[PDB]
Design a protein around this ligand. Structure first.
Ligand SMILES: Cc1cc2ccnc(N[C@@H]3CCNC[C@H]3OCC3CCS(=O)(=O)CC3)c2[nH]c1=O
Length: 130
């Protein structure tokens, strides 16, 4: 219905705003675009589902997220990919891992403060009806 389409449009607006606020944070620059294979050639072989904030924006615009839970799965993926690919004790690896956890924590904190639980519940119930 028109009301359900209005609901998902509001969701997309909300998700674009959250994602933009993450994307403009200097700490998260490394997560804004896909990994360049010329810089990191074994990434594609090690990480089976690459995810980044530009891919998240594309997925929002392709109507791929019907709930905030589905969106947070991809944010969690950005984080888990970083922990998997950069597991070493070296400062480079430790920096990106800290940034990855910060990205995750920041996304969850924004959502905790600004997502209405009844709005998310509505999204989930519409999704479950399809
Ligand atoms: C998304 C991503 C991008 C990336 C780009 C370059 N190098 C990586 N990993 C290196 C693997 C071996 N040890 C050093 C690591 O690079 C650390 C470096 C810290 C600064 S940063 O801006 O977070 C880019 C990664 C990278 N690992 C990644 O997971």
């Amino acid at each position: 219905s028109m009301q359900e389409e209005d609901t998902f449009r509001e969701l997309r607006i909300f998700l674009r705003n959250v994602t933009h606020r993450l994307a403009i944070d200097k700490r998260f620059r490394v997560f804004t675009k896909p990994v360049d294979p010329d810089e990191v050639p074994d990434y594609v072989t090690v990480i089976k589902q690459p995810m980044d904030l530009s891919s998240v924006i594309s997925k929002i615009d392709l109507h791929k997220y019907l709930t905030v839970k589905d969106y947070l799965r991809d944010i969690d993926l950005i984080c888990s990919n970083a922990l998997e690919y950069n597991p070493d004790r070296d400062p480079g690896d430790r920096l990106i891992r800290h940034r990855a956890c910060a990205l995750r924590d920041t996304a969850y904190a924004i959502i905790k403060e600004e997502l209405d639980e009844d709005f998310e519940q509505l999204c989930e119930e519409i999704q479950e009806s399809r």
